[PDB]
Amino acid sequence: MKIINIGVLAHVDAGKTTLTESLLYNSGAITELGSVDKGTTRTDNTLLERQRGITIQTGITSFQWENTKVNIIDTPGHMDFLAEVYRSLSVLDGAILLISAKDGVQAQTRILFHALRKMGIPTIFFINKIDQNGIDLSTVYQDIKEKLSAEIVIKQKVELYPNVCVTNFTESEQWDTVIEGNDDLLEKYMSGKSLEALELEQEESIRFQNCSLFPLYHGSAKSNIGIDNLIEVITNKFYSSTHRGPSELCGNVFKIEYTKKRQRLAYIRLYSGVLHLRDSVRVSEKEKIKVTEMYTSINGELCKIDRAYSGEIVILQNEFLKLNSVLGDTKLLPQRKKIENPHPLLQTTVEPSKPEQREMLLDALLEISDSDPLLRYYVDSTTHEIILSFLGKVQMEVISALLQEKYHVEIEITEPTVIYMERPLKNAEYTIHIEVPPNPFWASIGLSVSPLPLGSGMQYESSVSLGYLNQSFQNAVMEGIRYGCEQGLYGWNVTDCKICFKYGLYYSPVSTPADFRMLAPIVLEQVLKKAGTELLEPYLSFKIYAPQEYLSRAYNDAPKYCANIVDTQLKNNEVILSGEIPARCIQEYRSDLTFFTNGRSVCLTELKGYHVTTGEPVCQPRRPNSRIDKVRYMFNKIT
Amino acid sequence: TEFDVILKAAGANKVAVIKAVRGATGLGLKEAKDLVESAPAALKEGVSKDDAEALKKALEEAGAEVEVK
Amino acid sequence: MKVRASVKKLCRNCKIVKRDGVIRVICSAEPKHKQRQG
Amino acid sequence: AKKVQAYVKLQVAAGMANPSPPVGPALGQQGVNIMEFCKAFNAKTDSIEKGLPIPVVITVYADRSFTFVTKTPPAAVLLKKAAGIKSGSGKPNKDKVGKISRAQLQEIAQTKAADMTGADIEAMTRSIEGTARSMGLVVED
Amino acid sequence: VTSYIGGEGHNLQEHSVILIRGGRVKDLPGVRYHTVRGALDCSGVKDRKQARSKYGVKRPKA
RNA sequence: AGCCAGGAUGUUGGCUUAGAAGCAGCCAUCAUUUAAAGAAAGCGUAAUAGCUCACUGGUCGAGUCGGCCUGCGCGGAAGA
Hints:
The structure is cut from a larger assembly and holds chains A, B, C, D and E. Chain A is of the alpha+beta class. Chain A is 26% helix and 11% strand. In chain A, a hairpin with a 4-residue loop joins strand 7 and strand 8. Chain A is elongated and about 105 Å long. Chain B is built from 3 helices and 3 strands. Chain B has helices at 14-24, 29-37, 49-62, and strands spanning 3-9, 41-47, 65-68. A 3-stranded antiparallel beta sheet of chain B has the order 2-1-3, covered by helices on one side. Chain B is globular. Chain D has a two-stranded antiparallel ribbon. Chain D is elongated and about 50 Å long. Chain D starts with 58 loop residues before the first strand and ends in a 7-residue tail after the last helix. Chain D folds into 2 domains: 7-71, CATH 3.30.1550.10; 72-140, Arc Repressor Mutant, subunit A. Chain D is mostly helical. In chain D, helix 2 (102-109) packs across helix 3 (121-134). In chain D, a hairpin with a 5-residue loop joins strand 1 and strand 2 (66-67). Chains in contact: A-B, A-D, A-E. Chains A and B meet through helix 5 and helix 6 of A and helix 1 and helix 2 of B. Chain D binds one RNA strand through residues 4, 6, 8-12, 21-23, 26, 29, 53-55, 71-77, 79-80, 86-94, 97, 112, 115-119, 122-136. Chain D: Belongs to the universal ribosomal protein uL11 family. Chain D: One of its GO terms (biological process) is stringent response. Chain D: This is Large ribosomal subunit protein uL11. Chain D: GO terms for molecular function: large ribosomal subunit rRNA binding; rRNA binding; structural constituent of ribosome.
């Protein structure tokens, strides 16, 4: 009834989406341009994508061949913000990796491929760009075997020349190990004697349902050879859609996009049943939501539809639609999820241009939140500086170009807050005095801050005896000490404090908890003036995994980084090491591993150990503090 | 420590045999098939006794005729 | 390449020649040590 | 007898099982497991003593583990429990840090002869004792 | 305008769209408005019990 | 002068225990096995490893190397 979804894992800029376009041409017309070199339609959709020379996000395009539906999406294999492509895995059961002719499959492709192995769903190899010099007619496929780590075998063979053989093979005698894995095919193999290719084709279909091995493929789309029959393999080999219509209807959103004329479009697949046009439907928010409009995204043009077929995917407008929201409720599926294995891929500052336009720019950032799920930001800074969770080099170019296109704002930042923490240098006596020699309030105390071990945090004790400490008086001194911990003389946050209160003279008639509480901060700044201070910085551990052959070169990175050498161990061909470097220089470390590994590099880290010390000059980030009474008295204390 | 394991007859367990074969070597299902079908066929040459006896016992478990020389 | 007025041997594998009258210091090892004039 | 492949004479006190600040990445720098220097490192160490830095051959193969024949601790560290002072040089001829005698050091020298290579003991004697001389130590002959 | 942020503590910062009702404060001259706590980007006061129709707090789920 | 050879166990040595492991800096600058080998001139290491020279065999078979003094020359040497 319906048609199975098809992926497009063009890892390392495979260009597989162009293969999707040529496939869109072969499935045509009867009325279509047939596409063209570069961009070019091919469901490029948004501006800045085809102009950029690569899609900024995965698309969609209706198609038909062999009397059946054939949805497909591409490419998202670029960079870099590939997590949306991982989101695409929920959007379809099928797959079609575009293998490079350059040293077998791209190393970036291996991550999406292993992730596909995590997906639990079927996929097939494709020998893209067969019409080119240096093609691995018998070499690159071997790289595909050594890298695939499975049991994939070619369904056809070809070499050229102008040759474009496809169905002529394949794997006589030696082929059929996948059948050997099956007890039935193993039994027929036990029987001996030659047999029809279809007879092993049944067991090949059985293992194919399990995705035990990727189907063979060959030929470049540019040569117009094998680009058609492989699509036929995609049509026949593809798993049947789970058509039913039994109800009740259910499903979930896969992705959503903010078209400029949209203004929004929430794509969703019909996991079961069907939704009648202009009819009410269940939502994850536990509120009614009528389907006012929906239509299939045909590659030549968008088109409206009265109702969605079961197993079909289609965009739909809505007043609201949270990502992965239930359309039932509810669908039940189990799969692993990840986002480039990072909480944040090196966050960078993004202060808006202009005094007022930046405030709208934050709304533009909210619009960015509306787009790809794999992004986050918040104004953690007191200055309300932005800190995007987005990571990667080209992806920043995508968000920036998007800022320059759909919006009218831009910013340039990367350093972000140092997150420095000042600590006391040494213990020293101090006192605000007594009575009013003096300044208000009359309350005063003899604070005695002392040095503490790193990472100990703030500490204090009620050395003062009752009732001079007061059952509800000394606590104001503690909260006031915390108020003085809010910023040091350098403006850095207080750390490793050991404020042992001692003296606490006061007069009853004029004494107030607020007065002593005001007095505390003066004692804190006073002790801080005598302590001498000492800068403290984060030094989170940074585990890393790189190939052993480059492992020596990575050692060269050690000298170039503030991070100390640490224990590490081998893991097969892979190598690993436990680093430990300051967060201030840690951001460039990803670029370093990215450069030294030739993109084969990988790493992870987490913040730890506030103690560290740093140089030079003990620079500090202003500033504290304002919007509170008594600060003028503190300014008076300085002179 | 240089024992040769030859395969004389797969017996009434060509299945298990084929497994032992490819398992001891790693040749393509086909290659393995042909090998056995081309009996007698040398399984291994100049291998550790322990290994030789390991496969040998495996063949016996399946019920095949092996040769140790 | 350097074209200094003085052209002493830098590395060990430096060798002095006098091609076309102009003195040169060719180094089979390091290409940076190649120099003319002098 | 195969030549240089991976064997390296480096580890601290033999009583320190499975080190990471001392050796660590240095012993597990190659494919050999970090565990290999604790379960097997004390299989020979327990027979004599602990806390003594004693070098051992680490000829790594492709066969996971490796073949080895443990040797003999350096004369330097031997001159702490057998010298009195745990220190040494810094000030060789600038000041006499310590002293032993040929009657004791020649006495200890032939013990290490299983590793030492000489035509006669006397030679190893003046050798190791001279090693003692480098530490600022002067032999009470 | 310049509305007074009531309750104890707030999530408001820099921008953040809120909601404004009438009502002076009679202590801060120039301030003639209040913020509707719990409405829009302005969350309700944390851990309130009594008079939670104001401050926007929902009935204790526990 | 060229030519396959050789150019060692502790030296992870004490040192500020983060390393200095012939070679950042220290001082010492061992002595053996020996045709010879500095506990090392340079290179290469987080530090090792590693690659060289000192030195000495043999192959080889006649003059050759480094200063001093001076003579005459070359470079340094681009203008309307």
